[PDB]
Write a protein that binds this ligand. Structure first.
Ligand SMILES: CC(C)(COP(=O)(O)OP(=O)(O)OC[C@H]1O[C@@H](n2cnc3c(N)ncnc32)[C@H](O)[C@@H]1OP(=O)(O)O)[C@@H](O)C(=O)NCCC(=O)NCCS
Ligand SMILES: CC(C)(COP(=O)(O)OP(=O)(O)OC[C@H]1O[C@@H](n2cnc3c(N)ncnc32)[C@H](O)[C@@H]1OP(=O)(O)O)[C@@H](O)C(=O)NCCC(=O)NCCS
Lengths: 195, 195
């Protein structure tokens, strides 16, 4: 019944009319409260690649990502790429990837991820050197899914408490593409040169 | 009546019994929701310098700060101190400074700040090289107070949106002490050497 689901799946861009659905879906995935303006931006702004997967015409999954130059990476994650990659270097940040619970394990998430990769390849060619994202420490399912897909856990991000707000702890996961890699230690060089 | 307030002010450490009061006061200053554990930590943990100002025995202001090694600074603020200051270098982060609205402009805030400076001087001597804090962009009163007190606006901190949570925008303000300074550009060196 459901298991036929991929056969009935289509892909389309998110749009403004989807905002209520997106809030509901995002809300199911995590408890965070994004502002209305955020939802408006991801749905409508071309700067983001926002792609929905629909089952029988209804959204059951989405991926939202931004392709950006390396200088746009937040300092917490500044060390994902080695210094020898130029400021012109690009990365893709996955703001959100999610699939409705009933529809998981049907390949929808994989399809969304692959579509992003295809988009990057077309759009940025070899210039984009990494895809990175944040996951909550608690998301076993997500972590397993990314790890199986060659993402590496770059580092732990601690709880953040400030007058500005509060952040839960998390991990940064990175998939390197087109020769991208993290900064190398003396030992890393020693091995490459040494052998 | 109120104007006599400083004459009736005393200073004491925060303690566990203060948690409800602290929540109420902090809540008045800003809308952020810290967890109970945070309040428990600032009130009870010696790692923090948490000092209250009381008027007629009731808390009307507080300062909470942590003296820490430079490696403990978050990456967003990693560039507050120049690289030539050693990893052994210390800084103080002001988690909170606040005074009840009725009691403002009586010198309580200044007193709290000064007490922190005295504490740093006693505790860390010349080893601590900066005091830094975060302010919301909207806090005109706070900004004026710090600026008048020789704090400098180091940089803007943008809104942060992620699965981990949401942060409002802000500024990092820094007061340099004991010869501390930010990283120097080529031009900075050119001037020092040049003239
Ligand atoms: C991570 C996540 C997106 C995975 O999506 P999916 O579940 O749509 O992903 P897929 O179905 O492609 O892959 C999941 C597993 O099902 C397996 N699978 C694929 N097709 C299958 C099928 N037809 N029958 C049985 N299993 C199948 C896949 O092999 C994969 O297993 P593997 O990792 O061992 O290879 C999903 O777990 C999720 O939405 N988690 C929550 C993420 C979140 O919190 N997002 C917040 C954003 S606001
Ligand atoms: C910033 C803040 C702490 C200042 O405290 P105060 O108001 O207790 O500080 P002071 O009274 O020492 O100084 C304020 C002004 O009053 C002046 N003042 C001092 N004594 C005065 C007096 N007796 N009569 C009139 N003015 C006086 C001071 O000169 C100072 O002016 P200046 O900056 O021009 O020198 C207060 O504005 C505040 O609590 N803001 C909110 C901060 C916040 O949001 N914190 C969140 C933490 S969770």
């Amino acid at each position: 019944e459901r298991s036929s689901a991929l056969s009935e799946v289509s892909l389309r861009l998110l749009c403004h009319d989807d905002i209520d659905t997106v809030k509901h879906l995002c809300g199911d995935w995590a408890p965070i409260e994004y502002p209305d303006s955020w939802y408006r931006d991801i749905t409508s702004n071309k700067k983001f690649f926002s792609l929905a997967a629909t089952y029988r015409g209804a959204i059951v999954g989405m991926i939202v990502a931004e392709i950006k130059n390396r200088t746009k990476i937040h300092k917490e994650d500044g060390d994902i790429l080695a210094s020898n990659f130029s400021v012109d270097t690009q990365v893709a940040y996955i703001l959100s990837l999610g699939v409705v619970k009933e529809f998981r394990k049907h390949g929808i998430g994989s399809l969304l991820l692959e579509s992003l990769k295809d988009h990057i390849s077309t759009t940025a060619q070899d210039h984009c050197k990494a895809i990175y994202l944040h996951v909550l420490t608690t998301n076993n399912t997500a972590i397993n899914f990314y790890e199986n897909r060659d993402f590496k856990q770059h580092h732990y991000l601690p709880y953040y408490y400030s007058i500005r707000g509060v952040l839960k702890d998390g991990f940064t996961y990175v998939l390197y593409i087109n020769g991208g890699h993290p900064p190398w230690t003396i030992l890393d060089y020693i091995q490459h040169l040494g052998s």
